Amino acid sequence: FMVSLPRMVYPQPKVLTPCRKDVLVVTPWLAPIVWEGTFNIDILNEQFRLQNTTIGLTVFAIKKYVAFLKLFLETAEKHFMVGHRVHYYVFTDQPAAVPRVTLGTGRQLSVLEVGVSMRKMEMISDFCERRFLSEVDYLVCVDVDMEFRDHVGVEILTPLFGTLHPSFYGSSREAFTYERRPQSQAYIPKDEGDFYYMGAFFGGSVQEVQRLTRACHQAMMVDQANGIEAVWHDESHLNKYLLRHKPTKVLSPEYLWDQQLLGWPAVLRKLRFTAVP
């Protein structure tokens, strides 16, 4: 049950004026593609705050990657879901190397000690299943060697989302680096594929994320038993899953960018979450 929005004053959407004419803003299965200019964040914030939404954010920081936690978390505090309830889950082999980062109200951090390729998918689907269901409404799964530079908010939330890989959003599907060997569970032939999704940023409702990670983990175990490793590891499996189970939103490359490698093209009005140089 959803309570009514309050009265709000904002510009009228104009039916005969698109927000963005330079990019595709909806997929062929009617999922929004999230770009700056497509959403009114005030409306979305009202909708999600009225549901008292809690967002979990998972990150793995193993060995030297613990060094990236401080900037990751500090910039998440500035830019990720500000105003909403957030629960960070930091998976690490070095609990004592987790930096003590000051958190805003309504935000918490749990350190989860781990004991490689299948770790992420296995941990999200098997080890942490019950915990996430009780603690958060949505799960967002990202890599640690990153920083937030601009707003990443409730506009991303949906049952299941993937993110356009910044190196391939303008590429033809034959150029996508899908797994191409039919012997792998991640196989996608040359005439299939919507997009090349980035393994580093996906999410959705807890139920859908656990479904995805369970399916990918099972497929990875099948490949291991068959002596084959997909070309881009869990990213290859993520792509196969999202081909056959269409995401209900797709994030534009604003949400996963590498400025050193790709600059700042005109089509990107904001660079929100970026690789650390």
**Is there a binding annotation on residue 255?**
no
Q: Tell me the HSE value of 62 on the side-chain side, using a 13 A CA sphere.
A: 8
**Is there a binding annotation on residue 46?**
no
**Is there a binding annotation on residue 248?**
no
Does the active-site annotation cover 155?
Answer: no
**Is there a binding annotation on residue 258?**
yes
**Is there a binding annotation on residue 152?**
no
- The full DSSP string for 75-106 is HHHHHBSTTSEEEEEEEES-GGGS------TT
Q: Of residues 122, 155, 208, 235, which has the active-site annotation?
A: 235
**Is there a binding annotation on residue 65?**
yes
| Beta strand residue intervals within the chain, DSSP E | 33-34, 54-61, 85-92, 107-113, 138-142, 146-148, 160-163, 201-205, 249-251, 273-275
**Is there a binding annotation on residue 10?**
no
**Is there a binding annotation on residue 145?**
yes
State the Cα angle at 193 between 191 and 194, rounded to 5°: 130
Residue with structure tokens 């909806």? 26
What are the binding residues?
60-62, 65, 143-145, 165, 177, 235, 258
What are the binding residues for Mn(2+)?
143, 145
What are the binding residues for UDP-N-acetyl-alpha-D-galactosamine?
60-62, 65, 143-145
Active site (catalytic) residues: 235
